[PDB]
Design a protein around this ligand. Structure first.
Ligand code: PRO
Ligand code: PRO
Ligand SMILES: [Mn+2]
Ligand SMILES: [Mn+2]
Ligand code: NA
Ligand code: NA
Lengths: 476, 479
């Protein structure tokens, strides 16, 4: 069958991937006792947008649920799926002849049917008539709350939809749940995005020089991923010095200084499939003793979490595991003193890692389904920032991204709190003010017995220093 | 005073640039008989947006009028200008403490005042109180129609604005007219964006190889402009012999393989600190012009240079478009593609078959800049000319693109061959050879001076210059 491809060495993605997703969605809806026979899923694709009142185009990127179901790159489409039969119909714009002059050839409906391997193709201005002739019981539209943005998914609408019975509650939790579990075809794409991104991160480590601007590295990274991978930046983090303390840190215009710890967090996507990797490393290519200690603490928690991950593991337990390891290591360094058990009970870990350990990844970098009905957010420091509190199951894709930061306002808050202040050694901590931070982010897939690591970048102090010194890769 | 700067070799842009724009706007409004004493200009800046219902951020880019007046890069601001005194007040978001953790340092209001060289800074949630205490007569807000998009400009609004008298008609044409005429400080930025982009175009010509994907050149171009210039792609064109055909939108990767014998047409735009550039280079994929390629290319070079040589204050822009048409038709006849009277070809609008777009457009903070069709200036309802983005007379301070081209577009050629009024001009036996040629476009950015133009762009343009550039010759080499 047909595939998406940007030539050269880029990945061929079979359109069969999206056919399988439609099948899986129907199979799930059929088991839902509230779903009526004769229901049709109706999804509306994204449209081209312009900046404010200008004719300046914003780069078009397909809406994620619609992409998941159909893999369609063109703006202005709809897609429907007959739940009982699984039959797919794509609706495309009826374009005018002037489109031939400055946009391009006007493809036939046949062309799109073959391109996307759907059962039928019709024009958008005919959607109400086509759906009417199919005599559906109910139209299932998409509406629900994204638990990272807090935004409400926008329901499909078309001229004449008011004449149909519409249900906007059933679909969202079901299609979200399908997205949580990646198919083998989906995993192939995520392996690819991780491969390209990993290569780009290596090139960044090889290229960094004291005196460069952060955005020079962003530029190189993006150039590698686009020219070699057919990939683009996903969500709009190259922090050197105390900017590495800033989690989501426009062009990053800080000059990389000698002695800085760089924290390079980029994401990217191929055909709307994401990757999210973070590398930390000394700007000048040589870890100081302090940098090595902080860095190896995060390497330890990173590897402890990956090693412990398997089906049945509760994700908040992994977050707490990283906290405990960080506190142990900060104590070994002399930054902390006292009982680590007591430190954990006082939530001291969150002073140094205020964000969640990691998140679902897929078509969105912060992928859907972290907090389905019945799964609650934990109202404690650190944990409340987790983007899921679910138990792990095979097929889930997660980032594992512990970090340690020295953030003045969190440190000062702890120092003012008698329940936490006694753990902190001001005279040692003073040395780490302005250190910035370290974050190590891997992408992994949960397997039947553990995980599969998708990411492949230098991680040990030795590996990183060798990479940055320009040593041939084969060098040990 | 303070400046915007991205370090290294990038341009330092004084915030005085924006102060001058505010002063110029106030000076214009003070001369406007309908403007009430005590009026204040109220502009609302852009806000951060996310992809659909996700938390995936869209790259923030400031709204153009707001940028023109204030140069503010932060989302969620407002800006006001007292017309009678010129006093400026920037309103910035009151950020929560968690911002220190996730975004960066929470800057003071004094920090922003110093950064932007405005007279006062307040928090956005205090705008109604602050304006009430200043007792303005009228709030002048922004509403009007962009004549390229057809969209209506979004008026500023804030909770409590209903308690003020608001006029939304006066401001738009006046601030548009200010933007049409670039200051000396604005021209320095446009010279810079043209310099970086010109350098990037040279690198593309130097790097291109048969067998590459078009998007590989786009990537290289964008990397040069960003890493060396601090610039970003502006509006979402690397055509050989594909992005819209294969994926449905220009922003998609152009994934056509560049073939031996292809004519490349490389049209990119970009911006530095929201100031645009828009340049197009055409060149043979394999670095050697064929006779046919030389002939078509030199035809467009002739019209480019004829228009640039003719441009000066008082010239009617549509006359320049017609001049380019006539030259294209003359040269296509000299090639044997056309035959007969060029006077007759023009009367039959044959030029639009080969150049269906406008000769060029205003450029500034937007690539297709504002003010091309103010009230009283009409769009010409003829092929080609109806696509012009302005029908104004040229005056000093305007910045325009000059981008004639010749294309071989099957459905336009076929229409002409089926039209008895046009068909007899075309020689099918020669034209058939140019089916699939693609096209040539040569786009320069220029400033209208007191007596002519200043060319902003600096790329190889003659056949010899282009072949030398593609052969890896130093810039300073002149063949
Ligand atoms: O947003 C998140 O959850 C992670 C934390 C560090 C940056 N990205
Ligand atoms: O849109 C315009 O006016 C010009 C014509 C060719 C591409 N850009
Ligand atoms: Mn992440
Ligand atoms: Mn242009
Ligand atoms: Na991350
Ligand atoms: Na152009």
């Amino acid at each position: 069958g047909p595939s998406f491809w940007l030539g050269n060495e880029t990945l061929k993605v079979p359109l069969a991937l999206f056919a399988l997703n439609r099948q899986r969605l129907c199979e799930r809806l059929r088991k839902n006792p509230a779903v009526q026979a004769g229901s049709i899923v109706v999804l509306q694709g994204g449209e081209e947008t312009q900046r404010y009142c200008t004719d300046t185009g914003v780069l078009f990127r397909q809406e994620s649920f619609f992409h998941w179901a159909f893999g369609v790159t063109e703006p202005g489409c709809y897609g429907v799926i007959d739940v009982d039969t699984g039959k797919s119909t794509l609706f495309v714009p009826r374009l005018p002849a002037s489109h031939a002059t400055w946009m391009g050839k006007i493809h036939s409906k046949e062309h799109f049917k073959e391109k996307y391997a759907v059962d039928d193709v019709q024009y958008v201005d005919e959607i109400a008539s086509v759906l009417t002739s199919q005599k559906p019981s109910v139209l299932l539209t998409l509406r629900g709350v994204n638990t990272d943005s807090g935004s409400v998914c926008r329901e499909a609408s078309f001229d004449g939809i008011s004449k149909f019975e519409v249900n906007n509650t059933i679909l969202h939790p079901e299609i979200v749940e399908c997205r949580v579990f990646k198919t083998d075809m989906e995993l192939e794409v995520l392996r690819y995005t991780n491969k390209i991104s990993s290569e780009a991160h290596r090139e960044v480590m090889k290229a960094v020089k004291v005196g460069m601007k952060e955005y020079e590295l962003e530029s190189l990274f993006e150039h590698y991923c686009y020219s070699r991978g057919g990939m683009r930046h996903s969500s709009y983090i190259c922090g050197s010095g105390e900017n590495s303390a800033v989690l989501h840190y426009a062009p990053n215009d800080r000059t990389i200084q000698n002695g800085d710890m760089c924290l390079f967090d980029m994401d990217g996507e191929y055909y709307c499939f994401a990757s999210d990797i973070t590398c930390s490393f000394p700007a000048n290519g040589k870890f100081t003793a302090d940098q090595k200690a902080v860095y190896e603490a995060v390497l330890r928690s990173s590897r402890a979490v990956m090693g412990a991950m398997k089906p049945g593991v509760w994700w908040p337990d992994m977050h707490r595991l990283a906290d405990r390891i960080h506190l142990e290591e900060l104590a070994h360094m002399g930054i902390l003193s006292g009982s680590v058990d007591a430190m954990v009970q006082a939530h001291l870990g969150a002073v140094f890692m205020p964000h969640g350990l990691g998140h679902f990844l897929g078509i969105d970098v912060h992928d859907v389904g972290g907090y389905p009905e019945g799964v609650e957010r934990i109202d404690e420091p650190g944990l409340r920032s987790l983007r899921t509190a679910r138990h792990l199951q095979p097929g889930m894709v997660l980032t594992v991204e512990p970090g340690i930061y020295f953030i003045d306002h969190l440190l000062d808050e702890a120092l003012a709190d008698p329940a936490r202040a006694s753990f902190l050694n001001r005279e040692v901590l003073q040395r780490f003010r302005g250190f910035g931070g370290v974050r190590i982010e891997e992408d992994v897939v949960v397997t039947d017995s553990g995980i599969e690591l998708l990411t492949c970048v230098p991680r040990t102090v030795e590996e990183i220093e060798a990479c940055m010194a320009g040593c041939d890769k084969a060098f040990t």
